[PDB]
Design an enzyme around this catalytic site. Sequence first.
Site, PDB file in Angstrom:
ATOM      1  N   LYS A  17       0.828  -1.206   0.000  1.00 18.91           N
ATOM      2  CA  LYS A  17       0.000   0.000   0.000  1.00 18.91           C
ATOM      3  C   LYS A  17       0.862   1.256   0.000  1.00 18.91           C
ATOM      4  N   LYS A  36      12.895  -0.534   1.599  1.00 24.11           N
ATOM      5  CA  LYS A  36      11.463  -0.284   1.538  1.00 24.11           C
ATOM      6  C   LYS A  36      11.230   1.234   1.435  1.00 24.11           C
ATOM      7  CE  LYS A  36       7.181  -1.030   4.330  1.00 24.11           C
ATOM      8  NZ  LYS A  36       6.530  -1.992   5.313  1.00 24.11           N
ATOM      9  N   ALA A  87      15.152 -11.032   1.958  1.00 26.03           N
ATOM     10  CA  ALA A  87      14.674 -12.422   2.003  1.00 26.03           C
ATOM     11  C   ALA A  87      14.653 -13.009   0.590  1.00 26.03           C
ATOM     12  CB  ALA A  87      13.293 -12.487   2.643  1.00 26.03           C
ATOM     13  N   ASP A 130      -1.320  -8.397  11.776  1.00 27.62           N
ATOM     14  CA  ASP A 130      -1.413  -8.386  10.307  1.00 27.62           C
ATOM     15  C   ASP A 130      -0.648  -9.563   9.690  1.00 27.62           C
ATOM     16  OD1 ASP A 130      -2.303  -7.423   7.841  1.00 27.62           O
ATOM     17  OD2 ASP A 130      -0.677  -5.967   7.628  1.00 27.62           O
ATOM     18  N   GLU A 134       1.395 -12.599   2.225  1.00 26.57           N
ATOM     19  CA  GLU A 134       2.235 -11.573   1.590  1.00 26.57           C
ATOM     20  C   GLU A 134       3.185 -10.900   2.591  1.00 26.57           C
ATOM     21  OE1 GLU A 134      -0.656  -7.608   1.512  1.00 26.57           O
ATOM     22  OE2 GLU A 134      -1.350  -9.512   0.648  1.00 26.57           O
ATOM     23  N   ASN A 135       2.914 -11.052   3.888  1.00 27.10           N
ATOM     24  CA  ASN A 135       3.806 -10.521   4.929  1.00 27.10           C
ATOM     25  C   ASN A 135       4.669 -11.599   5.575  1.00 27.10           C
ATOM     26  OD1 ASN A 135       2.896  -7.907   4.576  1.00 27.10           O
ATOM     27  ND2 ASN A 135       1.422  -7.985   6.274  1.00 27.10           N
ATOM     28  N   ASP A 148       6.747  -6.903   8.057  1.00 25.67           N
ATOM     29  CA  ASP A 148       5.713  -5.847   8.009  1.00 25.67           C
ATOM     30  C   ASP A 148       5.045  -5.631   9.368  1.00 25.67           C
ATOM     31  OD1 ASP A 148       3.970  -3.857   7.193  1.00 25.67           O
ATOM     32  OD2 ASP A 148       2.907  -5.036   5.697  1.00 25.67           O
TER      33      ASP A 148
HETATM   34  N1  LIG Z   1      12.989  -7.849   2.953  1.00 26.24           N
HETATM   35  C1  LIG Z   1      12.299  -8.229   1.846  1.00 26.24           C
HETATM   36  N2  LIG Z   1      12.794  -9.147   0.992  1.00 26.24           N
HETATM   37  C2  LIG Z   1      12.118  -9.524  -0.105  1.00 26.24           C
HETATM   38  N3  LIG Z   1      10.920  -9.033  -0.452  1.00 26.24           N
HETATM   39  C3  LIG Z   1      10.294  -8.104   0.315  1.00 26.24           C
HETATM   40  C4  LIG Z   1      10.969  -7.643   1.534  1.00 26.24           C
HETATM   41  N4  LIG Z   1      10.155  -6.737   2.111  1.00 26.24           N
HETATM   42  C5  LIG Z   1       9.057  -6.618   1.331  1.00 26.24           C
HETATM   43  N5  LIG Z   1       9.136  -7.433   0.261  1.00 26.24           N
HETATM   44  C6  LIG Z   1       8.094  -7.530  -0.785  1.00 26.24           C
HETATM   45  O1  LIG Z   1       7.399  -6.271  -0.876  1.00 26.24           O
HETATM   46  C7  LIG Z   1       6.033  -6.428  -0.452  1.00 26.24           C
HETATM   47  C8  LIG Z   1       5.551  -5.237   0.388  1.00 26.24           C
HETATM   48  O2  LIG Z   1       6.357  -5.143   1.576  1.00 26.24           O
HETATM   49  P1  LIG Z   1       5.698  -4.712   3.003  1.00 26.24           P
HETATM   50  O3  LIG Z   1       6.859  -4.354   3.897  1.00 26.24           O
HETATM   51  O4  LIG Z   1       4.774  -5.838   3.402  1.00 26.24           O
HETATM   52  O5  LIG Z   1       4.907  -3.389   2.549  1.00 26.24           O
HETATM   53  P2  LIG Z   1       3.481  -2.868   3.111  1.00 26.24           P
HETATM   54  O6  LIG Z   1       3.731  -2.397   4.514  1.00 26.24           O
HETATM   55  O7  LIG Z   1       3.185  -1.746   2.159  1.00 26.24           O
HETATM   56  O8  LIG Z   1       2.579  -4.075   2.974  1.00 26.24           O
HETATM   57  C9  LIG Z   1       6.030  -7.741   0.335  1.00 26.24           C
HETATM   58  O9  LIG Z   1       4.750  -8.381   0.337  1.00 26.24           O
HETATM   59  C10 LIG Z   1       7.080  -8.575  -0.368  1.00 26.24           C
HETATM   60  O10 LIG Z   1       6.517  -9.120  -1.566  1.00 26.24           O
HETATM   61 MG   LIG Z   2       2.540  -1.676   6.554  1.00 28.96          MG
HETATM   62 MG   LIG Z   3       2.752  -5.894   3.810  1.00 26.75          MG
END
Ligand SMILES: Nc1ncnc2c1ncn2[C@@H]1O[C@H](COP(=O)(O)OP(=O)(O)O)[C@@H](O)[C@H]1O
Ligand SMILES: [Mg+2]
Ligand SMILES: [Mg+2]
Length: 260
Positions: A17, A36, A87, A130, A134-135, A148
């Site tokens: 988001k 990020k 990751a 949460d 996806e997290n 996340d």
């Molecule tokens: N450390 C990481 N390594 C690999 N992929 C990541 C990592 N952090 C986030 N992602 C990818 O980016 C997406 C969004 O990250 P996230 O931190 O969950 O954002 P938000 O808070 O907007 O949901 C994750 O669902 C994953 O697909």
């Molecule tokens: Mg968030």
């Molecule tokens: Mg997320």
Amino acid sequence: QWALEDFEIGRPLGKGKFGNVYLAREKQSKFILALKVLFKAQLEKAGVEHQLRREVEIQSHLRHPNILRLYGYFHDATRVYLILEYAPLGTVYRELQKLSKFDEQRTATYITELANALSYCHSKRVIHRDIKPENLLLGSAGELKIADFGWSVHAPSSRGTLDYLPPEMIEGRMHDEKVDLWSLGVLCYEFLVGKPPFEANTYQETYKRISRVEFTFPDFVTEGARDLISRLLKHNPSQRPMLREVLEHPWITANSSKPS
Ligand SMILES: Nc1ncnc2c1ncn2[C@@H]1O[C@H](COP(=O)(O)OP(=O)(O)O)[C@@H](O)[C@H]1O
Ligand SMILES: [Mg+2]
Ligand SMILES: [Mg+2]
Ligand SMILES: CC(C)[C@]12C[C@](O)(c3ccccc3CN1)N(C1CC1)C2=O
């Protein structure tokens, strides 16, 4: 301290988001990591400064092999940058799309790792709130890592998809650690079946199915998985088991490849 100029940016890892996440390498050490990126205007309009501070604060002090590290942050005139552990094997979400559903051994192994990480969190009275595919990220040896922490807090407390939220949270009521146990049950079901147990076509109907706890099992779900899932998805939070009971559940110990 850190600034953008200290990093070479590479391919997009995923989108959220607010977050736009990139592969990056720190120039002087050649350390590979994930960056990020968040837009200040968006964070400002949404008014979620407090959530971002909690994410940075909580996740940078947590130390557990099944929890994603956060090393620090910086910001410029338009953006905020969170420096994360990279990751390399992606999300549990992607892996589920690839395979449709997980066998019992893969599921039980993921649940143990999750329960191990959540146990560490709750010991500090941190609740995540949460938990969803996806997290959940994967390490170089395929091990699960929770990420996340934008929605996390210090229990007790008040406050997209409703699919992973318990009745007390969706109904605006009060909540504690037990919310994470409800989400654990939702995840166990979705791993084995291919979709979450309260999924529906509209927000309004999903809300109805969660609050009434209306779910059923396909024929191929075994007695042991049924027993564990039915214990986790209780309306009354206090009736939900403790994480220790989860880790010692017969179906878990019979199928999992990793210890507590
Ligand atoms: N450390 C990481 N390594 C690999 N992929 C990541 C990592 N952090 C986030 N992602 C990818 O980016 C997406 C969004 O990250 P996230 O931190 O969950 O954002 P938000 O808070 O907007 O949901 C994750 O669902 C994953 O697909
Ligand atoms: Mg968030
Ligand atoms: Mg997320
Ligand atoms: C310098 C100040 C204006 C600030 C503080 C901030 O709340 C914040 C929060 C968590 C992490 C970093 C940052 C960055 N600095 N914020 C983001 C817009 C939310 C800023 O722009």
